[PDB]
Every structure is written in structure tokens, then in C-alpha cells.
């Protein structure tokens, strides 16, 4: 009945310049792959082209040139569409992972999409209009000012890499690669080794560390990006959270909120050079199919006896992250045009990885 | 084109490789001198994926001889193969690790490791096209195991794309002559899972049981162990040097054999081992070779299949014969124990077949097998290791050197994963 | 001149292409050397031969072929065998390890290493053809280098020349025997190869060559060797129309346009009727009638598949040797009597016939016995899709473990390719159930 990991996908919408360059062939083109159909389901590649009856009958046994139904029907936990705003979008994302960090469960969540689908837009946003990150912290602190009578709170902010299955501080740079190490504690706390640690009293100091972080972040150009990640940033608020007028002694609480950014995956197509490139690819990838291997186990409760943690750093980094115990939601954010039309189908499925509703 | 570097770490990897590069030497027609005497032209049509040319038209072995103590070198070089390899490749320090996993590790091999590592280079630099790497050690002892996984990290730091094959002896739970083993092995166990592609788990007690069961040998002695182990390295790399009907190299093995990136623990063998009086009375057949194969009893590892399933396995064959005999067999073998094969993988057997048989037989078989029953190897390990801990019976001599508890706990939290991953697959749907 | 280009990729297509010009070597008379003895002795200048070989000035004869590997060990046997001196030194290899049995390797990363100099060569060898009738591509579906570099290498041919035709002569692996782990997740991943930039694709399988050389031949423990020379009969079969005159002459662009009835429908069948050893050579009249009925069986059939559980779409028999048409007649009229060949109801034609005059030439130190007729079948039938369900459940059942995944994946593959590649190959076998219902 109950499943602690959900998917939410959101649906970019269409750019002015994209759709003004795009509409004129509906009136390259747009051709709209993505169609909502409802809120937990959405269609990829419909058959809605206006004339369509001159090759319909091709699919009735006459000529046998195209057989092949590309439209998929997709189901997901949450569909977020392309006027939903990043309040509508906040508000049944990651409020309950909050509510769960302050009871004192570990909290996670996730950020995927290829090049261009609007990641950036939605976790980040703008000054103007911020994203999901900002609302989080915000009613972080504002929950913790109206909370501070009869309890004493505590935050911690690290922000790390993943990176050649290598872990890399970010707001410490400088330091060796091997020197970071998970050590897994006997009391189930990953506490990787020689983490830098600060406190922020702010959102404002938390975006100022955020950004901080970003500029060490590893990054090279790509096909058509300019900026292309190449690494897993993993962010992580540690609440520490003690009783200030009741028990006042050494037993106290702490919890941990994950906002997990995840590379893309790459077809190596795309790199001809290659070289380092491919090889960051290659682990990039690698990774990828390590999570989907530990959140389709978690889903499945046949599977439950060993969800392979050890097969990337980033799934071990999580390991007391994904259970039951822990919320955890996904973002998926996909583009409706057709120039990322393969790519977005790949995300799509990989969403569709999290839990296989064969039901349409 | 496609050429390995092969390292030799501690005494018992030092020796395996000397009985190797004799057994190798001897395939491709080389004398001690390093001239080449052979009588057949495919001997140097692909000599360059082991050794290295030299003036005088001689034949420099790609080895790479790493210890801390010199005994053993002096042992070598004063062996009959001895002359044949550089004198630059011996690096060894004076001060042994004294079974110590730490002193190997941390404190002894910290400094010989630069060495061996610029004689690595220089040799690897050299190469057309690097195939991968090849060790030889021990875990359960002192200088092999931590030299050697010191090595195989850095190399994995600095050839991330190569293949780095390992053939391993694991300590056996009744031939023992070393108390600390089972620290050794799991700290090397704990380095190997994560930084190999292949490890070939290689185990005295299955060799001894060989050497007496089937060889019918009265007094093994390890020249014995040596020979069966230096086969099994030989056969595996066969379809690099020469050619055949079906080729078969390191990398489409690791493809072919590791299901998931963890489970890369095999278990070796050699198919015609017989006694010299017994020869005459059998028939040497394909058919032949599978039944002694997959008997469990010639084994190098000491893990009986019957109590687990075979997730993978490879048969490389060498000499004149018909596919369709061999492929005919292995579908036998598939069929009629299909208990012992896991259900989600329809062809559990890579085949491959070289034309060109091991000098002295009409044809030979190597076996690669990947089962859940290595599980029960590491689960004897664990359980010393425990008993150990517990008590923290000889830890002050691993602290002593700079280690920590935390590392001992991470090693054995990491080899119960290993189980539990073998596990997992034991019992399937 | 009529021209075809061979193209051999992987250990399969080598000793395949290797069999087969022994045999074109055996046929025209032309020696390991490439020197033709007869063009000395009597003086020459009326053979066909141009079909496969381009002649230079002292009177060599140098095949039209490109044999590719990512490995040397194949090709560097071939530079050192007995017809080292026939082909071209451009026999090309990757001076690096082989693509290790996955689609990835051979596709993305180490292909594109070697894939301009091949489209190089074919380049030459096309503007040394006049009349270039199309490309003959030999590999292997369950393999390496023969899947995805076959792959890479079809996409540039059809984006570069188009409008030539294209044949694939593959081998399928068998249901049972199978001698890699990973082969039906290369053989899914060539499914849009074989479909989309194929012309007509040629499927065998090992065990059903295998059964054939046990059961007809009397050869208890064959070799790759005799499979090779079976299929380089069959392939010599369907190119004698363009080499020599005949009765009725059937070229490819013929060939294809009565065998294939759709667009995506383009995998038959291929058969051999007269395979026998010489000793049961004797005892046996091996006229046109019994041979044509021998290309029926599905004994006989060199993809193990029952025809007899689905329907003929088309048929195309190419007969060499002493052959007379209403022989041919007549044994086609035999064929329709009987009920359990079935046709479709919208094929009431059926049959495309062929007859060349020069019959099968025997290979010194062969198997198949010396004869004076031959026929080829090639069969447009439904019942192959039943073989591609049986590799369809195999991939199965490692995809939903993701088993063997991580390879493919860490080697510029997405994991997406390959759930599609598992849809494309369903339409496919959706296709082959719904041409076989009859017209309402
Ligand atoms: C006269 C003769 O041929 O007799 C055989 C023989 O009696 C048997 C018993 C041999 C013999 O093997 C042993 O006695 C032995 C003892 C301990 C460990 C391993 C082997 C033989 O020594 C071993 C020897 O093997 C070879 O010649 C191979 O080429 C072998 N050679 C070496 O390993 C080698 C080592 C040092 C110096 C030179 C060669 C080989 C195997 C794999 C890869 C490369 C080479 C063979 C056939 C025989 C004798 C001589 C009795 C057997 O071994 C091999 C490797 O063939 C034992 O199982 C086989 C079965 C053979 O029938
Ligand atoms: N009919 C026939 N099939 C062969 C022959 N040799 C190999 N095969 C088939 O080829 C398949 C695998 O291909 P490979 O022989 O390994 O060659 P490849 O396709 O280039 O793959 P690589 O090993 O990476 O080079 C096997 O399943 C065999 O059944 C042959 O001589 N004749
Ligand atoms: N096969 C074989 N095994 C050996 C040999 N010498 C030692 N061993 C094994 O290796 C273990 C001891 O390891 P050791 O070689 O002393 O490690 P080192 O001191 O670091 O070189 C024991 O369990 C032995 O069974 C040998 O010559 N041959
Ligand atoms: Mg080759």
C-alpha cells in the first residue's frame, strides 16, 4: 500500500524563441511528445497529428511499411505540468520531507534530467522567481524560529561530489580525493571522513555556501552544452535538534535532509574525441544503473533480502537514506520538444525504473 | 598487441611466477639463455604479449619481481631460470613484513612501492597496446598480500581501463601455518572486491587433494602446487598467442563471466590430470575432459559446487576437435545438472578453442567457474576473523603500525556484503 | 560489368569469407596465387569472373573483398595461409583487443577507431566497379565486432550509398547451444540494423548445420569448416546467375523483388537440397523432383524452425546443373498438390524460378559428394518468427535482473537502447503473425 520512495515529474514549458521557431510547423518543428492525460499518468508520442488517416490504414494489415506504435503510456506517483508553478510544485514535493527531518527521519531527494529540460530551473530557479531549494530552506528556518521555545536546534550544511567514484569536498576543496572515505558508524550514520562542516544562521548563507560550492563543482563542454556536469552533488542539512526547559542532559536527535543532483546519462555517440570524457561517462552511467538498482529493490519487496548498496559510491553514501524509514521523492524533469526526443523518452523510463505500474 | 605485465609479490608469488615463466618459456621454445630454439614458426608469432626483445635476438620476460626481503630473490636468480629475467625488475627491500597485513601495507611497502611502481611504467610504457595486468600472491601471509593490493590500487588509480587479473591463494581452513591469516585475508579481501576484474581464488588444500587423489603423487612438495597453478595461468591467456576456432580473450572472459561488478571470485581447474601408471588406460576425448572438469573433486579452490549454483562459467579449450562435440557437451552438462546452474541465465558456459595443444598432449581444457559456493570460503574466514576480534588476540602488533579498529570492522562488514550478495543468488526466482 | 562487394566482419564472417573464395577460386579456375592458368594455355579473354575479382595488368586477379576484425588473430592467419598472396595487403585490424562479446564495444567505442578506413577501401573498390549490383555482408548476430561493428558499418553504407542493395548472410545462435553468455542481448541489439538498413537478410544456425552434417553427410564430429563450406555453396548458388549463363538468369534486384513482399519482411530462409556424402552419392537418382522435395523438409531447413507451423509467403528455387524447366514444372505443381505446405491466399503465384547451366563445383578435400544437380531454396515463410520468440524470452531473463548490464552501460551505451530494441524486435514478430491471416 504505502511506498516511501515517490516519482514527481514535472514538464518544462515550451521557450519563447523555441516556441515561436517550433509552432510554425504545427500551424525543424515541436511536434509535442509530451500529452498529460491525468496527474499520476501521461502519454509519450501520441498519434495526435491532425492528418494522420493516409497512413492509419498502414497499421491495418494493407501495407506494412510502419507497424511499430511509438506512443507509451507512462504512470507515475505525481505529474507537475507545464503552467504548474514552483509553489504548486513545493508544496506536495518535499514540505512532508521536512515535516519527517523535524520528527527526526532522514529525508532524501532527488534531481534528474538531461540537458535543457529545465533541472536548473526548477531546484535553483532565479532571484526573481527561486526554486525548490530556497522554499525548502526558507520554511526550514522558519519552522525552527517557531520552534525555538522549549527546543534547541542545530544546523549543519556539507556539500560534496561524486565524481570517477572518487568523493570530493566542495566547499573544502584542496584536499585529497583519498582522505574521503565513508566509514559507517555502528550506530548507522554514514559521516564521511574529513568533511568540512559549516553553520549557517540563513537561507542567504546557505545559497552563498550553495554557490560556493557550484564554482568548485567539475564541469567541461559538451556536444551542445557549454556547461556540462560530470559529477553527483550530494547536499546534506544536518538538524540537530535537543529538548531546552525538559530533560536537559546529553541525550538529544539529529536528522539529515539529502538534495542529491544526478549527472545525466550520456551516449557516447554524442563524444567523438572522447578520451577522459568517455571515461567520466562511463562511471556517470554506471552509477545511474547502481541507484536504479537500489530503488527498484527498495520497491519490490521480494528483492528486500540485498539491495546492492556497494556497487557505487553514491548508493553507499545512502544507504540509511532510501529505506522505509526515510522519505524519499524523485524529480524528473523532461522536456516536451521533440529535439531532446530520445533523451527525454531514456529519462522517461528511467523514472519508470522506481516502480513498474504496468496498470494504465 | 594485447601484451600483460605480469607481478610477482611475496615468497609464494615469487615462486609460482618462476614455475610460470619455466612453464611459458618451455611453450615457446626459449632456453634459460633467452634465445629462442623452437621448431614451429606460430611459437613467435605472438611472443610479444610476454616478452620483450632484446639485441642479440633474446627474449626479455615482462615480469616485475617485488619483495622485502631479499631471500627469495637470491632464490630465483640462483634457479634455473634465473639469467632469463632483467636484473632491473628485482626491487626488494631488506626488512621483511613479518606476516604483518600493516608493515606490508603501511610502513615497509609505502616505500618499495614507488619503485616498483617506476619499473611498472617504464615496462608498461614500452607495451604496443596493454592488454592488462597479471598477480601473483598470497593473502594469507605478510609481504603478498599487502604489497600486492597496495599495487593493484594504484595501478587501478592509474591504468582505470586495464584489466587487472589476480590469482590469489586463499588460506585453507585445515592447512595452516600461519596464525595471523585470517586478518590478511580479509584486509586483502576487503582491498580486492573493490580494485580486480578477475581473482582467481587458488587454495593449497585443493591442490594437495589434487596432487594426492588424482596425480596419485606420495610426496607433493610445492614445485607440484607450482605446476598445476602455472597450467591454469598458461591455459588461461592461450587464445592471445595462438589461434584457434573460437578466441577467447581476458576481457571477453570478465565480460562473459561477471554478471554484476562484485562477483569476480572464480574457481579454476585443469582438465587432464592423471597419474603416469594410469595413461595408458583411458582415451583421450573431448568428452573426457568435460567429465573431469566439472567433477568437483579437481577444483583449485576448495569450494564444492554442489553447494551452490554456478552463476558463470568458461571452458577454454586447446588442440584439434569438432565444435559440435563441445558445444554437445556443454549442453549436456547443462541439462543434467540444471540445479547446480542459476535459472535467469539460459547459457551459464562461455566456450572458447585453441588449435595448438600444450606441447606434450594431444588436447587440454582450462575451467573458469563462478558459484555461490566461493561464499563459504569467505564465511570460514570471517569466522576466524571474529574469533580474533572479539579478543582482539594479536591486534596490538596491526595498531602498532598506524592502523585503526574502524579499518578492521570496514574489511569485515565488506566481505559479509560479498556473502550476502553470493547468497542472494544462491537461492534465485 | 555486373559487380558485388563481399564484406566479412568478426571471426564468423573471415572463415565464412574464407570458405567461400576457395570456392570462387575453385570455380573460375583461378590458382591460390592468383594467377589463371587457362588465360596462359589457350589464351583467355572470354570468362566471366568480374562478378568477384578485378583483373590488373600481368594477370593477377584480386578479389572484391574487405575483411575486418578488431582483433589480428583471424587476419593475420589469413596473411600467412595458403592464399596470402590472393587478396589485397588492405586487410584491415584493429592493432588493439577485440570488442569482448558486447554491442557497446564494437559499436561505440573501439568501432569508430577503424570505421573510416574501411568505408575508405569500400569507397575504392566501388569506383572500381562499373555495374555494382550490391554489398554481400557476412557476420555474426550473437558476437562482438560482427553486431555492433556490423551495425556502424551498415548505418554509414545506407547513408552514404542508399540505393544499393544489401544482403546479409548471418548466423543466428541456436535455442539450445549457445557459445557465449551475453549473445541475446548482441542479437536483440541488431535487430534495427537487420530491419531498417538491410535489404534482405540470410539467417542461419549452428545446430541445424549440425543436424545436417550428422544426418545427411555421415559426419559424426564436424567442424566450423564444413558449415563455412555448406554456406559458401549456398551463397555460390544465389551469385552463379550473375557469373554464368544459364536458362533462365535470376539477379539480386530480381531476387528481391519476388521474394520480398513488404518492406520489413525481408528475412527468408535459406536450404541446400543435395547434401550427401559420396558414398550415398550412389543408391540415389537425386533427379529435380526429389530434390526439390528435399528442400521442403523441415529437417533439411538450416534454421531451426518448423515451416510446417506457419505459411509460405514466397519461394525462389535457383537449380544449377543439368536441369530442363518442365522438370521444374512439374515438381512445383508436386509441391501444390500437397497440403501441408501452405501458401498465403494474396501469393496464388508462389514460386520464382532460376536455372543456370554450370553445375556445382566439388571442393578437393570436401564433404559433399560430386553431382550433376543442385538447387538453392530461399523461403519467405512465417515460421521463423517462432525462433526469434524462443531469443526474445533468453533476453528476458537477464533483463529483468539486469544481469551483464553494467558493461554495456560503462561503455557509451544508455540503458534505454536496450528496452527498445526489445519493443522493435515485438513489432517485428507482430508483423510475421499478421500477414498470415487470411484476406476477410
Ligand atoms: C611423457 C608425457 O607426456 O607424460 C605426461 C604425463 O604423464 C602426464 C601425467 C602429465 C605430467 O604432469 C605431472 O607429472 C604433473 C605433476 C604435478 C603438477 C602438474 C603436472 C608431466 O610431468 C607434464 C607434461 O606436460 C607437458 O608436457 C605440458 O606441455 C605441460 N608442461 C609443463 O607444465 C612444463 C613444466 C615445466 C617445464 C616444461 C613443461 C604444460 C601444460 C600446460 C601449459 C603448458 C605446458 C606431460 C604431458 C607429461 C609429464 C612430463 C609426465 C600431466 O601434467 C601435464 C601438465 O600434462 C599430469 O596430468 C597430465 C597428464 C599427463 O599424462
Ligand atoms: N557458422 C559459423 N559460425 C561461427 C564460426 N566462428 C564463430 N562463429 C559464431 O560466431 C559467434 C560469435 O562471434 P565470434 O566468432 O566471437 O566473432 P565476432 O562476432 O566478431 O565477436 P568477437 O569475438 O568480439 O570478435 C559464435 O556464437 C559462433 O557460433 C564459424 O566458423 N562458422
Ligand atoms: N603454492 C605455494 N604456496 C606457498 C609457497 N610458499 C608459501 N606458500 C603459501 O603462502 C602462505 C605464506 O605466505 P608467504 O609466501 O610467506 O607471504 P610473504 O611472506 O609475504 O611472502 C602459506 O599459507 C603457504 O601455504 C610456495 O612455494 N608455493
Ligand atoms: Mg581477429
Redesign the pocket.
Given at each position: 500500500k504505502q511506498s516511501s520512495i515517490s516519482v514527481a515529474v514535472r514538464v518544462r514549458p515550451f521557450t519563447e524563441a523555441e516556441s515561436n521557431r517550433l509552432v510554425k510547423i504545427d500551424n525543424g518543428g515541436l511536434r509535442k511528445i509530451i500529452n498529460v492525460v491525468d496527474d499520476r499518468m501521461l502519454i509519450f508520442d501520441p498519434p495526435e497529428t491532425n492528418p494522420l488517416t493516409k497512413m492509419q490504414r498502414n497499421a491495418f494489415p494493407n501495407s506494412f511499411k510502419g507497424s511499430r506504435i511509438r506512443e507509451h503510456r507512462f504512470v507515475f506517483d505525481r505529474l507537475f505540468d507545464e503552467d504548474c508553478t514552483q509553489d504548486q510544485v513545493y508544496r506536495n514535493t518535499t514540505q512532508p520531507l521536512l515535516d519527517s527531518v523535524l520528527d527526526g527521519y532522514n529525508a532524501t531527494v532527488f534531481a534528474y534530467g538531461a540537458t535543457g529540460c529545465g533541472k536548473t530551473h526548477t531546484i535553483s530557479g532565479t532571484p526573481e522567481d527561486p526554486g525548490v531549494i530556497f522554499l525548502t530552506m526558507k520554511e526550514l528556518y522558519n519552522r525552527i524560529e517557531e520552534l525555538k521555545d522549549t527546543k534547541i536546534i542545530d544546523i549543519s550544511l556539507s556539500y560534496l561530489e561524486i565524481y570517477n567514484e572518487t568523493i570530493r569536498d566542495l566547499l573544502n576543496p584542496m584536499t585529497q580525493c583519498k582522505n574521503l572515505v565513508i566509514r559507517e558508524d555502528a550506530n548507522n550514520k554514514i559521516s564521511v571522513s574529513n568533511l568540512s562542516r559549516h553553520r549557517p544562521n540563513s537561507v542567504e548563507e546557505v545559497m552563498q555556501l550553495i554557490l560556493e560550492g557550484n564554482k568548485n563543482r567539475t564541469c567541461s563542454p559538451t556536444e551542445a552544452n557549454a556547461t556540462s556536469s560530470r559529477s553527483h552533488a550530494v547536499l546534506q542539512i544536518n538538524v540537530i535538534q535537543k529538548d531546552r526547559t525538559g530533560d536537559i542532559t546529553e541525550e538529544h536527535t539529529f536528522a539529515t535532509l539529502s538534495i542529491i543532483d544526478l549527472a545525466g546519462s550520456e551516449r557516447a555517440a554524442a563524444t567523438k574525441n572522447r578520451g577522459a570524457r568517455l571515461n567520466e561517462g562511463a562511471n556517470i552511467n554506471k552509477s545511474l544503473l547502481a541507484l536504479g538498482n537500489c530503488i527498484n529493490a527498495l520497491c519490490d519487496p521480494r528483492r528486500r533480502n540485498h539491495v546492492p548498496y556497494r556497487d557505487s559510491k553514491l548508493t553507499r553514501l545512502l544507504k540509511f537514506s532510501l529505506g522505509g524509514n526515510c522519505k524519499t521523492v524523485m524529480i524528473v524533469c523532461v522536456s516536451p520538444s521533440s529535439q531532446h526526443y530520445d533523451e527525454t523518452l531514456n529519462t522517461l523510463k528511467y523514472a519508470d525504473r522506481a516502480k513498474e505500474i504496468k496498470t494504465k | 598487441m594485447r601484451e600483460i605485465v605480469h607481478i610477482q609479490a611475496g615468497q609464494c608469488g615469487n615462486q609460482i611466477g618462476a614455475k610460470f615463466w619455466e612453464v611459458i618459456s618451455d611453450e615457446h621454445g626459449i632456453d634459460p639463455t633467452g634465445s629462442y630454439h623452437g621448431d614451429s614458426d606460430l611459437q613467435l608469432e605472438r611472443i610479444n604479449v610476454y616478452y620483450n626483445e632484446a639485441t642479440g635476438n633474446k627474449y626479455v620476460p615482462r615480469a616485475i619481481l617485488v619483495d622485502l626481503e631479499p631471500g627469495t630473490m637470491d632464490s630465483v636468480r640462483s634457479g634455473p631460470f634465473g639469467q632469463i629475467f632483467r636484473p632491473d625488475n628485482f626491487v626488494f627491500g631488506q626488512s621483511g613484513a613479518g606476516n604483518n597485513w600493516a608493515k606490508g601495507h603501511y610502513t615497509e611497502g609505502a616505500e618499495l612501492v614507488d619503485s616498483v611502481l617506476d619499473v611498472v611504467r617504464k615496462e608498461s610504457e614500452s607495451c604496443d597496446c596493454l592488454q592488462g595486468f597479471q598477480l601473483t600472491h598470497s593473502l594469507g601471509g605478510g609481504t603478498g598480500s599487502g604489497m600486492g593490493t597496495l599495487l593493484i590500487s594504484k595501478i587501478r588509480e592509474e591504468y582505470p581501463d586495464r584489466i587487472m587479473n589476480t590469482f590469489s591463494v586463499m588460506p585453507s581452513p585445515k592447512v595452516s601455518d600461519t596464525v595471523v591469516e585470517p586478518y590478511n585475508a580479509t584486509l586483502s579481501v576487503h582491498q580486492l572486491v573493490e580494485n580486480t576484474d578477475e581473482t582467481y581464488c587458488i587454495d593449497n588444500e585443493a591442490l594437495y587433494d589434487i596432487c594426492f587423489r588424482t596425480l596419485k603423487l606420495t610426496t607433493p612438495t610445492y614445485g607440484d602446487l607450482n605446476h598445476l597453478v602455472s597450467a591454469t595461468m598458461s591455459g588461461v591467456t592461450t587464445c592471445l598467442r595462438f589461434p584457434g576456432?573460437?578466441?577467447?580473450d581476458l576481457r571477453?572472459l570478465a565480460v562473459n563471466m561477471v554478471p554484476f561488478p562484485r562477483l569476480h571470485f572464480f574457481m579454476p581447474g585443469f582438465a587432464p590430470l592423471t597419474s603416469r601408471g594410469s595413461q595408458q588406460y583411458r582415451a583421450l576425448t573431448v568428452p573426457e575432459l568435460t567429465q573431469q572438469m566439472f567433477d568437483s573433486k579437481n577444483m583449485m579452490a576448495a569450494c564444492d559446487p554442489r553447494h551452490g549454483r554456478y552463476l558463470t562459467v568458461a571452458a577454454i579449450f586447446r588442440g584439434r576437435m569438432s565444435m559440435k562435440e563441445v558445444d554437445e557437451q556443454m549442453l549436456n552438462v547443462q541439462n543434467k545438472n540444471s540445479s547446480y546452474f542459476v535459472e535467469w541465465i539460459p547459457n551459464n558456459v562461455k566456450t572458447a578453442v585453441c588449435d595448438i595443444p600444450p606441447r606434450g598432449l594431444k588436447m587440454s581444457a582450462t575451467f573458469i567457474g563462478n558459484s555461490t559456493a566461493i561464499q563459504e570460503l569467505f564465511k570460514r574466514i570471517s569466522e576466524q576473523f571474529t574469533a580474533m576480534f572479539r579478543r582482539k588476540a594479536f591486534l596490538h602488533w596491526y595498531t602498532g603500525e598506524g592502523m585503526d579498529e574502524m579499518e578492521f570492522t570496514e574489511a569485515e562488514s565488506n566481505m559479509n556484503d560479498l556473502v550476502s550478495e553470493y547468497q542472494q543468488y544462491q537461492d534465485a526466482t | 560489368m555486373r559487380e558485388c562487394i563481399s564484406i566479412h566482419?568478426?571471426?564468423?564472417?573471415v572463415?565464412?569469407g574464407n570458405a567461400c573464395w576457395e570456392l570462387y577460386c575453385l570455380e573460375h579456375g583461378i590458382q591460390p596465387d592468383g594467377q589463371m592458368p587457362s588465360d596462359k594455355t589457350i589464351g583467355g579473354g572470354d570468362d566471366s569472373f568480374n562478378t568477384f575479382f578485378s583483373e590488373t595488368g600481368a594477370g593477377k586477379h584480386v578479389p572484391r573483398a574487405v575483411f575486418v576484425?578488431?582483433?589480428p588473430t583471424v587476419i593475420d592467419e589469413v596473411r600467412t595461409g595458403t592464399y596470402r598472396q590472393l587478396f589485397h595487403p588492405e586487410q584491415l585490424i584493429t592493432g588493439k583487443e577485440?570488442?569482448?562479446?558486447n554491442y557497446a564495444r564494437?559499436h561505440y567505442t573501439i568501432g569508430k577507431e577503424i570505421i573510416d578506413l574501411v568505408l575508405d577501401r569500400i569507397r575504392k573498390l566501388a569506383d572500381q566497379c562499373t555495374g555494382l549490383q550490391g554489398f554481400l555482408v557476412f557476420?555474426?548476430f550473437?558476437?562482438?565486432?560482427?553486431?555492433g561493428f556490423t551495425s556502424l558499418l551498415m548505418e554509414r553504407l545506407s547513408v552514404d550509398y542508399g540505393k544499393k542493395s544489401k544482403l546479409e548472410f548471418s548466423?543466428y545462435?541456436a535455442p539450445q547451444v549457445?557459445?557465449?553468455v551475453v549473445?541475446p542481448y548482441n542479437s536483440i541489439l541488431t535487430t534495427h540494423t537487420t530491419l531498417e538498413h538491410s535489404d534482405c537478410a540470410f539467417m542461419?544456425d549452428?545446430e541445424a548445420?549440425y543436424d545436417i552434417c550428422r544426418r545427411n553427410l555421415d559426419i559424426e564430429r564436424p567442424t566450423?569448416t564444413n558449415?563455412?563450406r555448406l554456406?559458401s555453396q549456398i551463397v555460390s548458388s544465389i551469385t552463379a546467375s550473375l557469373r554464368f549463363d544459364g536458362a533462365l538468369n535470376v539477379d539480386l534486384t530480381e531476387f528481391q523483388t519476388n521474394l520480398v513482399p513488404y518492406p520489413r519482411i525481408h528475412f527468408p530462409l535459406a536450404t541446400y537440397a543435395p547434401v550427401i556424402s559420396a558414398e550415398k552419392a550412389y543408391h540415389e537418382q537425386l533427379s529435380v523432383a526429389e530434390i526439390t522435395n528435399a528442400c521442403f523438409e523441415p529437417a533439411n531447413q538450416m534454421v531451426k524452425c518448423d515451416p510446417r507451423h506457419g505459411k509460405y509467403m514466397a519461394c525462389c528455387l535457383l537449380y544449377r546443373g543439368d536441369v530442363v524447366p518442365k522438370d521444374v514444372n512439374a515438381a512445383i505443381a508436386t509441391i501444390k498438390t500437397k497440403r501441408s505446405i501452405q501458401f498465403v491466399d494474396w501469393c496464388p503465384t508462389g514460386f520464382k524460378v532460376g536455372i543456370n547451366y554450370q553445375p556445382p563445383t566439388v571442393v578437393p578435400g570436401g564433404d559433399l559428394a560430386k553431382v550433376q544437380r543442385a538447387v538453392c531454396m530461399l523461403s519467405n515463410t512465417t515460421a521463423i518468427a517462432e525462433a526469434w520468440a524462443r531469443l526474445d524470452h533468453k533476453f528476458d531473463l537477464m533483463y529483468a535482473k539486469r544481469a551483464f548490464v553494467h558493461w554495456y552501460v560503462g561503455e557509451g551505451m544508455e540503458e534505454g537502447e536496450f528496452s527498445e530494441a526489445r519493443e522493435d524486435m515485438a513489432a517485428l514478430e507482430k508483423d510475421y503473425e499478421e500477414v498470415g491471416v487470411d484476406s476477410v
Open positions: - | 576456432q573460437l578466441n577467447a571477453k | 566482419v568478426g571471426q564468423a564472417g572463415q565464412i576484425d578488431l582483433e577485440d570488442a569482448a562479446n564494437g557476420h555474426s550473437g558476437g562482438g565486432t560482427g553486431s548466423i545462435p549457445s557459445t557465449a549473445e542461419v549452428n548445420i566450423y558449415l563455412n554456406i
